Amino acid sequence: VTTATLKRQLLQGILQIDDTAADVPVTYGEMVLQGTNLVTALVMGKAVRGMDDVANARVPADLVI
Amino acid sequence: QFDILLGTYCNTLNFVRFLELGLSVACICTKFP
Amino acid sequence: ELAYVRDGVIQFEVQQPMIARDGPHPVDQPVHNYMVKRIHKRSLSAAF
């Protein structure tokens, strides 16, 4: 992340434009909410998130190498 | 009031080829019972 | 279902390879150390 006059001096000295267009994928993830969470919360009060161990759009940008 | 725990995650490190390089370019294995 | 968390505790486990040596120096044995930490919750305010 660069800005201000530092970015200008960098692009004047050693940084050159290589790319013009780029794409960013969209990935959404929703955790499961079905199970014993409701009963365990109503009998205890706290909840523990388990199940962690078993065994588009175009935006201009500039890239340098 | 209640407390919510995120979870526990284990680290899964990687490895590099050493059986076919370190034991082939530096030392030589020879059995001698 | 986002609400107050009141901070909490965390745990991490990273495998660190050991070393093997012998001689006048004392032998070395693997050890395990666990350190707990805390978290900070920010505040959001917006009004007109």
Q: What is the DSSP letter of C44?
A: -
The DSSP H or E segment spanning B10 is none
Contact C6 B2 (CB under 8 A): yes
Look up tokens 């919360």; give the residue: A41
Report residue B24 as tokens. Answer: 């082939």
Q: DSSP string spanning chain A?
A: ---HHHHHHHHHHT------EEE-----------SSHHHHHHHTS-EE---------EEE-----
A15 neighbors A8 (Cβ within 8 angstroms): no
Q: How far is CA C25 from the centre of its chain?
A: 31
Q: How far is CA C26 from the centre of its chain?
A: 29
- Distance between CA atoms of B26 and C7, rounded to whole angstroms? 52
Among candidates B3, B10, B11 on the partner chain, residue whose Cβ is nearest the Cβ of C8 = B3
Report residue C35 as tokens. Answer: 């350190």
- Distance between CA atoms of C16 and C22, rounded to whole angstroms? 20
Look up tokens 């486990």; give the residue: C13
B10 neighbors C15 (Cβ within 8 angstroms): no
The DSSP H or E segment spanning C27 is none
Among candidates A45, A48, A53 on the partner chain, residue whose Cβ is nearest the Cβ of B5 = A48
A14 neighbors A21 (Cβ within 8 angstroms): no
Contacts of A52 in chain B (CB under 8 A): 7-9
- In this structure, the strands spanning A58-60 and A47-48 are unpaired
Query: Is A58 touching B (CB cutoff 8 A)?
Result: no
Phi, psi of A47 (to 5 degrees): -130, 150
Contacts of B9 in chain C (CB under 8 A): 12
Among candidates B2, B8, B11 on the partner chain, residue whose Cβ is nearest the Cβ of C15 = B11
Burial class (CB in 10 A: 0-12, 13-18, 19+), A3: exposed
- Distance between CA atoms of C30 and C19, rounded to whole angstroms? 9
Resolution (angstroms) stands at 8.3
Query: Is A55 touching B (CB cutoff 8 A)?
Result: no
Query: Is C22 touching B (CB cutoff 8 A)?
Result: no
- Distance between CA atoms of A17 and A14, rounded to whole angstroms? 10
